[PDB]
Design a binder for this molecule. Structure first.
Ligand SMILES: Nc1ncnc2c1ncn2[C@@H]1O[C@H](COP(=O)(O)OP(=O)(O)OP(=O)(O)O)[C@@H](O)[C@H]1O
Ligand SMILES: Nc1ncnc2c1ncn2[C@@H]1O[C@H](COP(=O)(O)OP(=O)(O)O)[C@@H](O)[C@H]1O
Ligand SMILES: [Mg+2]
Lengths: 387, 393, 284, 889
């Protein structure tokens, strides 16, 4: 634990070899000198003597209190469960490092002195917003993205994985990333994909949920969001659907809209105002890209804007092939009947096709597949777009 | 598979690692009592667990805290409430002097006989305790090159009267305590804030503009009270506001059912800013991107005195910011930046840093030690074309 | 065990004896598994036969095409409208053990067991037999999304988060479905529950004459009636009549038998009850 | 997985490179033109650092292994034409076609032969083809060959030229970061013969770059923080001429070649003092180079600036010796009086005012021995700059009242009162001298040498303390007369008066507590590889202590005068000289562990540390060599402050686990002097851990050991918030921890930090990390602190003025020739930077900004700004000259 701070060579310098060999021989020496304690006089007057002595010095009925303030070294001000607040001194038994205001504590009966501290719980917010596990498919699910994957990778993946390029030059990575393009493009696919294959925490955020019947929490939700993301661990934040919530000051009106302006304001300063967050990855999803606030658009906040094109007949043959990979396929079908015909159809449309097969064939409970399944399915999605 | 990048590559790595693990194995071998639900490791409280905790036990009693109302004549005869327990007419213990027991004070009193024992620091809630920065980021004035007029104007206000309260007496003038910053985003206001806070030599206090809007009535004002209280307490302290548009931008009353509460709070900032017994030694720095939709009451001088703006560098501010964001990075000895800034007719310092860091990303992806000068050429090319056919632009 | 009473001292507060719980409140309010034995509701019966009777009898079909079998179901229409009992029967059509969940507001306030009322319910579903569970407007009335979020959590949307905690698992339905019928459909978090978790909703068109006639017998079913009546004429006397309203029609007819000083639910009772029930239905 | 169809490189370079029997034979264009076209395609496409799996570097080798396996490892007819485009694409992707045992046969592929030069086609490279190859050479092959027989044929000749191009090659792709990576090649290459590598690397650096001398230079000193025993010896003398030939800084010569004075031999930096007299360039950088030569790391160098140049460039000498010392006087002369210093703060004895109102009434602490601490309320506070006219009347009455050693003590505090004085220090002593007292005369006169210490102006070369010694039939006339002249003449190693006081030891007159402090005092003038005084001492040791050794007054004072001055040396010969003359038995062999590590102050010898614990750890031999292991742990105390943070963390980890947790008499009696010698600034780690064994005194022992540790736990950066700790332990120590033996002690430690409110420098550290006395004067206290009545009679001579080698405090000063400047400084934290980049921030705490005399503090490396021109030294040192110039401000 903090045995030696020096990492300055950052190489195989003989400096470092001398360092770690010295520290090695020191550790061996300590382990051996202490090793010769249980050899000449192996004794056990330091497990239950001090532990039992203080377990009896302190008390039972371990009343749980609440920290109020910290003063000097030993006396602090505490608050009982009802409000009776006492100016009680603390013992040198609890971790003074994990002692901050707003924390549960252990108190005595007579003097009510601070005895111990209770560890905190896992806040419900993390359980609510954080995608807990690898939710969905890994990189076998892409229909097609290579420059997108490159941008997001060397923006996030390559930095954390191999942090031996940024500290060579002292160059920090880009901060913000806007994923934009037509809808049904697979933004959720890539976000849940990097969330699947990742090593740091991940957060998913929706924008429509930032409207309270109570007045002005909003930025409360934002600030607590980034607070948990920062305090928790290496954080990969993702906010989808900021377009219908942060576009611009269209008319400078009031009554709710002004409230949203304040909220996106707090997401702006809170985005990056003061004393740069650090270890705070930020990723933003949008459908449209022109009706966005350029103050958020400027560098410092977002440094990578990625377009999401729509392939025509090359990756579609793998998208129909992925959405038909886990399904039967009679020999009457050929994917080129519909792949070799159109050149803009979204992967969401291939999904509605390969699922519409599962609706058509088994609505009638027929056999595996027929070509008219893909015919009626493709036409059905054609009315899904056209209608 | 791999190769030896530096001579004894693993030969230092595993040698370091196994002794690092052996540091643990020493600890678990000797026996360590960890995870005892919030205590200290026995190695340091075994020789503190003695009667030199009873020295905290008996010499220091519970000392229940209470609040003072008023005093009486010829004698203390103090009237005090506890918090919600009851109100008493109590007296100080002999351990105190009858001077620093002035009214409105949080004081520790005995639980048994109800006699005052200790004067306390007054109450200050965490919601504002956390906005006090308590630290100064390392932001040197040189990092804000390209605004020589602005940094000079601000220097005349927030710096010169404080560090030299001599000229203004020798001539008999008062400094303009109220400064507002404005201009296009991504320009050097935040930087100026952090730099001024660097040499602040003062209780500098951040304020986030949206932090005041709340769910209950008047509570945000109650914030403001504690703000100007900690201000008046901390002599020579600075206050920063940021995007104050949320507060009091207008007085929309055609259909007077829109925003009113932060209007009232804005009024409280009005009074506690100026009017009725001015504040004394305090300085206010603001900054907004749209200083156009604000209530003229803030626009009155005395409160918002100077209006400093940050512009877009014509050709040379971008050059110097190439010297700012291109200096703190590894490049070859073949630098030249006038060629660069002549290529970016309209770009901010933030975009300048974007091009400088984007410069490194080529060698970073191309397995190189440093951003070579020519690699920086490639960087400005991809950002010249990138900014030329930019998404929004 | 957590959430259990204990005998305590008053001086040292030493445990004397772990006192027994009263009753596990969800286990005393254990939802009914009665014998799972509608003029107006027959078209949607097929829809629930395909959203339920298909994946249940046919694992190998949506396994063959590798698509998540629809387990989550939604319907919509006027109040009640057989949303309850139609599900009650569809759970039985494949011998799949209907599990009612009224839980309207009586379980919503229960904070202690709100973290398990879903758990041991679903354990019941997987333990008894193939079992179909049904939900209704209760969650839509309790909590929808983070509106009651950071400001208290409302004790309900969190339990919903445990619901999605369980739906985000692995069932493929197998033969088990979960139906839902609710108004106020534009508030909940169905965006997350669209993929895989839950699925389509079917509409309710109005009832008909023979529909309200068979309804008339089925809800005049637990009574004491008389022969010598064209009940068809009675169901034909209510052109613009809904479903459940017909039940109040039967109650009104029983009221008229009450005022007739006899137990015979005769044609007089219905012939007047149509007039009175419709008269109450005369406001717009 | 997008492979297939586009693997042209995995096809044409998989077929033509495959069939050398079909390509080399029967196809001249097939072996030559396709391999050459695979050499520009692989050298341009598979030869640069671009990723893990190149188009060829990982792909052409998957089947390119056997493809390469027979193209040209076996033709047995190789000529001078089939070596350029035959070892042409097979050779480059070698390191990942083979496996980890490539270091033994790493000479057949690209170490085999390049077409002309490594840069002919490894100039378009970073490290794949030739660079990392060359590192793979000098790692293993040139070491195994260069162990015994270097000059064989080709593992030396081509290596000789290759090293010259690799050396500048680390700076060649970019002269920036792996510049310091080059010393990974010159140091790992021929570890012991580093001067053989730095002999070519020295001039190659001299032609490398004027701007590129300081960072690889500081990487040489970086690898000279500690190295192999023959490498710290070598690369340090290598380190000198870089600012002498290529660069020209040369103001880090006098002090930072004190790096390289002693670790090589006796005379190197006296020829480097001649180097000063040869580098007689402009007298501001000269003047400040010679500033440190009197009272900043060493003194007595004032017999070498009296040559023909005695006008101003050699008249700087006496200015160094006492005149710039007189500006050290003016420091408080016009700076501390003006800023923060009246002559008598007197708030230590008064800050203990509120304690009487805690526990009821007072007036119960009436211990007379507490008046011994009453002398230090004046003694410490005036310690350097300040006087008292009848402000010493407490020592006037108590001096004429009782406590004879209190008369020596109170008479001894006067020199602390008038410290760094030459004008009237004797005039003050003369009035209080004529009282017919031995303790008073021998105390004030001994204080006089404290007064003129480091001065070298005539105060009493043979006047005051020689006349004091010439009446010595008796008590501290005989005893303390020899201490003050050794204290005053410790910085100036004059041998004559030391020969005057060598008959003090050679007298053989009864010197029970006089002889040990005799060798200590004359040792203060010149001990340490002591040629004569080690002689005269241990002659009398073999005469008397050979037949009696009971207390530490005999045994604990002689070996200190065996090897205690030259604790900056590391030759380990004087341990042989002095030690072998007393090689008798265990008690006279207690000195065995003295000079062993007294030539081992700070350096890299963790193997010496394991021989410092493993030999004598506990061993429980029923109180025979328990002192032997106590002192062996005492030598664990040095080699922990200046291994540059290496020994500190491991000493706190070890001491915090072994002794205080599960230990013996060694830990429960003496184990805190490691902190009484290790840290001098104070931090919360030991600052809290020590009172975890201090508030709990464990008085079952001779509790004045934990009370001794009480005193030197107040040893931290002068003033601190520790007054809570010391004050509270004085309240709990009022009744408990009796005032009969501690009343002087508690306030003694209370007042030590707050003496003149500054001025603690005996840390054996200067500039940033080098060495400088601090041990002859500090150490004898901590050795003098064993347990008991050595605080009673013999102790009062040392315990008061034991250590007085403190060289002021701070650096805020201008010294532009008129000395009027107040140049804008900017206080911060110590510079934490060793190598990260080119635009790298020297400190972090940029908030504070001063201009004039301020606070140095332990971790501070302030620079300043505005470029008002710090050209004098640019390496700090508190009397900069400020050559003023407008360098484009
Ligand atoms: N002249 C400049 N020199 C150096 N850096 C600059 C300059 N102009 C802009 N920048 C960079 O661009 C970013 C934007 O600057 P700043 O934060 O002061 O603008 P802002 O007005 O606070 O932003 P907003 O208007 O969106 O609140 C900064 O982080 C800064 O590093
Ligand atoms: N290239 C593709 N391969 C596979 N599926 C795709 C592809 N493109 C789009 N989709 C489908 O279309 C949906 C659209 O995803 P996304 O763009 O995140 O939604 P939105 O546009 O509403 O944000 C995805 O859930 C995915 O199932
Ligand atoms: Mg800003």
């Amino acid at each position: 634990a903090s045995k030696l701070p020096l990492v300055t060579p950052h190489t195989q310098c003989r400096l470092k070899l001398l360092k770690l060999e010295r520290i090695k021989d020191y550790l061996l020496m300590e382990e051996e000198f202490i090793r010769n304690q249980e050899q000449m006089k192996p004794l056990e007057e330091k497990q239950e003597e001090e532990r039992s002595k203080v377990d009896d010095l302190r008390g039972t009925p371990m009343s749980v209190g609440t920290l109020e303030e910290i003063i000097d070294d030993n006396h602090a001000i505490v608050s009982t469960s009802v409000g009776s607040e006492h100016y009680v001194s603390i013992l040198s038994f609890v971790d003074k490092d994990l002692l901050e205001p707003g924390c549960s504590v252990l108190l005595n009966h007579k003097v009510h002195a601070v005895i111990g501290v209770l560890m905190d719980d896992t806040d419900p917010l993390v359980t609510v917003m954080k995608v807990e596990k690898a939710p969905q498919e890994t990189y076998a699910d892409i229909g097609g993205l290579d420059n997108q994957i490159q941008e997001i990778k060397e923006s996030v993946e390559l930095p954390l994985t191999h942090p031996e390029y940024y500290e060579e030059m002292g160059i920090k990575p880009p901060k913000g990333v806007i994923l934009y393009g037509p809808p049904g493009t697979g933004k959720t696919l890539l976000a849940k994909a990097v969330a699947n294959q990742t090593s740091a925490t991940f957060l998913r955020v929706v924008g429509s949920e930032l409207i309270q019947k109570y007045l002005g929490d909003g930025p409360k939700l934002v600030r607590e969001l980034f607070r948990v993301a920062e305090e928790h661990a290496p954080s990969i934040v993702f906010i989808d659907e900021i377009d219908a919530i942060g576009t611009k000051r269209y008319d400078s009106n009031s009554g709710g809209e002004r409230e949203i302006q304040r909220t996106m304001l707090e997401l702006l300063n809170q985005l990056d105002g003061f004393d740069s967050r650090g270890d705070v990855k930020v990723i933003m999803a949008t459908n449209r890209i022109e009706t966005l606030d350029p103050a958020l658009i400027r560098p410092g906040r977002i440094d990578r804007k990625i377009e999401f094109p729509l392939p025509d007949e090359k990756t579609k043959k793998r998208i129909f092939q992925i959405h038909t990979s886990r399904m039967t396929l009679a020999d009457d079908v050929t994917l080129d009947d519909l792949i070799m015909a159109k050149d803009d159809l979204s992967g969401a449309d291939i999904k509605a096709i390969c699922t519409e097969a599962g609706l058509m064939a088994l609505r009638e409970r027929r056999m595996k597949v027929t070509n008219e399944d893909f015919k009626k399915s493709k036409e059905n999605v054609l009315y899904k777009k056209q209608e | 598979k791999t190769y030896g990048q530096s001579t004894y590559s693993r030969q230092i790595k595993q040698v370091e690692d196994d002794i690092q693990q052996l540091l643990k194995k020493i600890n678990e071998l000797t026996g360590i009592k960890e995870s005892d639900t919030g205590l200290a490791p026995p190695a340091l409280w075994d020789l503190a667990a003695d009667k030199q905790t009873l020295q905290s036990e008996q010499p220091l009693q519970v000392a229940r805290c209470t609040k003072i109302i008023n005093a009486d004549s010829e004698d203390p005869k103090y009237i005090i409430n506890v918090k919600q327990f009851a109100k008493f007419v109590v007296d100080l213990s002999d351990q105190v002097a009858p001077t620093d027991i002035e009214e409105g004070m949080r004081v520790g009193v005995d639980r048994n006989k109800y006699q005052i024992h200790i004067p306390l620091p007054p109450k200050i809630d965490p919601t504002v305790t956390m906005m006090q920065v308590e630290e100064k980021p390392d932001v040197t004035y040189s990092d804000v090159g390209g605004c020589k007029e602005q940094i000079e104007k601000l220097r005349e206000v927030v710096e010169t009267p404080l560090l030299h309260p001599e000229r203004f007496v020798n001539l008999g003038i008062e400094p303009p305590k109220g400064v507002l910053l404005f201009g296009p985003p991504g320009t050097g206001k935040t930087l100026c804030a952090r730099a001024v806070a660097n040499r602040t030599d003062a209780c500098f206090i951040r304020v986030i503009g949206s932090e005041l809007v709340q769910k209950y009535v008047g509570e945000g004002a109650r914030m403001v009270r504690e703000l100007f209280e900690m201000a008046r307490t901390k002599k020579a302290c600075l206050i920063f506001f940021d995007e104050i548009d949320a507060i009091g931008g207008a007085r929309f009353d055609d259909g007077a059912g829109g925003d009113n509460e932060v209007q009232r709070t804005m009024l409280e900032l009005i009074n506690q800013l100026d009017g009725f017994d001015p504040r004394g030694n305090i300085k206010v720095l603001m900054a907004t991107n749209r200083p156009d939709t604000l209530d003229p009451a803030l626009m009155r001088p005395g409160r918002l005195d100077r209006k400093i703006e940050f512009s877009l560098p014509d050709l040379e501010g971008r050059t110097h910011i190439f010297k700012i964001h291109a200096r703190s990075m590894s490049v070859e000895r073949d630098i030249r930046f006038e060629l660069l800034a002549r290529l970016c007719p309209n770009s901010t310092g933030a975009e300048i840093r974007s091009v400088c860091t984007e410069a490194g990303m080529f060698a970073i992806r191309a397995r190189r030690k440093i951003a070579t000068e020519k690699d920086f050429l490639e960087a400005v090319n991809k950002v010249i074309k990138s900014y030329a056919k930019f998404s929004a632009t | 065990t957590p959430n259990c009473r204990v005998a305590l001292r008053n001086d040292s507060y030493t445990l004397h004896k772990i006192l027994p719980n009263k009753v596990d409140p969800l286990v005393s309010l254990m939802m009914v598994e009665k014998v799972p034995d509608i003029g107006g509701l027959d078209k949607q019966i097929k829809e629930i036969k395909e959203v339920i009777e298909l994946p249940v009898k046919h694992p190998e079909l949506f396994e063959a095409l590798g698509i998540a079998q629809p387990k989550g179901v939604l319907l919509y229409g006027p109040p009640g409208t057989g949303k309850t009992l139609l599900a009650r029967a569809v759970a039985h059509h494949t011998d799949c053990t209907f599990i009612r969940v009224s839980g309207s507001e009586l379980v919503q306030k229960f904070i202690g067991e709100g973290a398990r009322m879903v758990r041991e319910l679903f354990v019941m579903a997987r333990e008894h037999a193939p079992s179909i569970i049904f939900m209704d407007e209760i969650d839509s009335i309790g909590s929808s999304r983070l509106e009651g979020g950071s400001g208290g959590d409302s004790e309900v949307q969190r339990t919903m988060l445990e619901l999605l905690n369980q739906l985000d698992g692995f069932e493929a339905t197998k033969n088990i479905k979960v139906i839902m019928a609710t108004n106020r459909i534009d508030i909940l978090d169905s965006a997350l529950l669209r993929p895989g978790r839950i699925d389509r909703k079917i509409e309710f068109p109005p009832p008909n004459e023979e529909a309200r006639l068979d309804i008339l017998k089925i809800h005049s079913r637990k009574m004491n009636l008389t022969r010598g009546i064209n009940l068809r004429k009675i169901a034909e006397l209510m052109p613009g009549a809904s479903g459940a309203e017909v039940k109040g029609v039967c109650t009104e007819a029983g009221m008229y038998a009450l005022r007739e000083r006899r137990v015979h639910v005769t044609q007089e009772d219905f012939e007047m009850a149509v007039a009175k029930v419709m008269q109450k239905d005369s406001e717009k | 997985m997008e492979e297939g169809g586009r693997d042209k490189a995995p096809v044409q370079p998989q077929q033509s490179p495959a069939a050398a029997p079909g390509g080399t034979d029967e196809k001249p264009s097939g072996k030559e033109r396709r391999d050459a076209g695979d050499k520009d395609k692989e050298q341009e496409l598979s030869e640069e650092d671009k990723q893990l799996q190149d188009e060829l570097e990982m792909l052409v080798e998957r089947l390119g292994e056997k493809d390469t396996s027979l193209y040209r490892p076996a033709l047995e007819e190789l000529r001078r034409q089939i070596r350029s485009s035959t070892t042409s694409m097979t050779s480059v992707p070698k390191p990942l076609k083979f496996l980890r045992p490539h270091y033994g046969k790493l000479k057949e592929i690209y170490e085999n032969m390049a077409p002309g030069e490594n840069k002919r086609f490894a100039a378009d490279i970073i490290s794949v083809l030739a660079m990392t190859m060359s590192g793979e050479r000098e790692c293993l092959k040139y070491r195994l060959v260069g162990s015994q027989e270097e000059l064989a044929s080709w593992g030396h000749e081509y290596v000789r030229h290759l090293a010259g191009e690799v050396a500048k090659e680390w700076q060649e792709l970019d002269d920036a970061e792996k510049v310091q990576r080059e010393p990974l090649l010159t140091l790992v290459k021929e570890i012991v013969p580093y001067n053989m590598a730095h002999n070519a690397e020295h001039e190659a650096c001299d032609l490398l770059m004027e701007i590129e001398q300081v960072d690889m230079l500081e990487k040489d000193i970086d690898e000279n923080a500690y190295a192999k025993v023959c490498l710290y010896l070598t690369s340090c003398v290598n380190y000198v001429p870089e600012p002498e030939n290529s660069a020209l800084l040369r103001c880090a010569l006098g002090v930072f070649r004190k790096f390289s004075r002693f670790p090589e031999a006796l005379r190197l930096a006296l020829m480097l003092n001649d180097m000063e007299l040869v580098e007689d360039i402009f007298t501001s950088c000269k003047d400040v180079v010679v500033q440190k030569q009197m009272a900043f790391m060493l003194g007595r160098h004032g017999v070498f600036l009296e040559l023909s140049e005695d006008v101003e460039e050699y008249e700087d000498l006496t200015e160094i010796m006492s005149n710039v010392q007189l500006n050290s006087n003016f420091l408080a002369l016009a700076r501390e009086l003006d800023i923060m210093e009246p002559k008598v703060p007197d708030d230590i004895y008064k800050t203990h005012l509120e304690n009487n109102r805690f526990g009821g009434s007072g007036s119960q602490v009436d211990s007379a021995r507490m008046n011994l601490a009453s002398s230090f309320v004046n003694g410490f506070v005036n310690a350097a700059f300040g006087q008292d006219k009848l402000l010493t009347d407490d020592g006037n009455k108590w001096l004429y009242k009782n406590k004879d050693h209190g008369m020596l003590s109170a008479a001894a505090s006067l020199g602390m009162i008038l410290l760094w004085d030459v004008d009237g220090g004797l005039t003050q002593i003369d009035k209080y001298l004529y009282s017919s007292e031995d303790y008073i005369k021998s105390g004030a006169l001994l204080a006089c040498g404290i007064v003129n210490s480091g001065v070298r102006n005539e105060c009493d070369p043979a006047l005051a303390l020689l006349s004091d010694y010439v009446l010595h039939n008796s008590n501290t006339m005989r005893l303390g007369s020899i201490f003050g002249l050794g204290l005053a003449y410790a910085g100036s190693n004059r041998e004559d008066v030391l020969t005057l006081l060598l008959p003090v030891m050679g007298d053989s007159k009864s010197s029970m507590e006089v002889a040990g402090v005799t060798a200590l005092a004359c040792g203060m003038i010149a001990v340490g590889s002591c040629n004569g005084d080690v002689t005269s001492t241990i002659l009398q040791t073999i005469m008397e202590k050979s037949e009696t050794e009971l207390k530490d007054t005999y045994a604990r004072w002689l070996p200190l005068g065996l090897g205690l001055n030259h604790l900056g040396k590391g030759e380990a010969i004087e341990a042989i000289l002095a030690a072998l003359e007393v090689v008798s038995e265990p008690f006279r062999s207690f000195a065995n562990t003295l000079v062993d590590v007294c030539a081992y102050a700070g350096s890299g010898n963790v193997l010496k540390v394991q021989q410092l614990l493993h030999i004598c750890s506990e061993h429980f031999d029923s109180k025979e060599k328990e002192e032997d292991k106590d002192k062996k742990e005492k030598k664990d105390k040095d080699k922990k402050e200046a291994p540059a943070d290496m020994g500190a963390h491991q000493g706190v980890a070890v001491l915090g686990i072994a002794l205080i947790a599960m230990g013996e008499e060694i830990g429960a009696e003496m184990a805190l002097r490691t902190f009484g010698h290790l840290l001098r600034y104070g931090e919360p780690t030991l600052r809290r851990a020590v009172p975890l064994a201090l508030a709990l005194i464990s008085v079952s022992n001779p509790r004045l050991n934990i009370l001794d540790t009480l005193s030197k736990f107040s040893h931290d950066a002068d003033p601190e918030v520790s007054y809570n700790s010391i004050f509270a332990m004085g309240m709990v120590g009022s009744g408990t921890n009796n005032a009969r033996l501690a009343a002087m002690l508690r306030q003694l430690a209370q007042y030590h930090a707050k003496d003149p409110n500054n001025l603690f420098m005996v840390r054996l550290a200067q500039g940033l990390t080098h060495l400088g006395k601090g041990t002859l004067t500090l150490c004898p206290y901590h050795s003098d602190r064993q347990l008991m009545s050595q605080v009673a009679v013999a102790g009062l001579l040392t315990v008061l003025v034991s250590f007085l080698d403190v060289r002021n405090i701070i650096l805020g000063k201008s010294h532009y020739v008129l000395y009027g400047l107040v140049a804008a400084m900017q206080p911060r934290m110590l510079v934490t930077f060793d190598e990260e980049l080119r635009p790298l921030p020297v400190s972090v705490r940029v908030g504070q900004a001063v201009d004039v005399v301020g606070q140095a503090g332990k971790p501070k490396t302030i620079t300043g700004f505005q470029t008002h021109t710090t050209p004098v030294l640019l390496a700090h040192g508190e009397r900069a000259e400020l050559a003023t110039e407008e360098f484009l401000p």
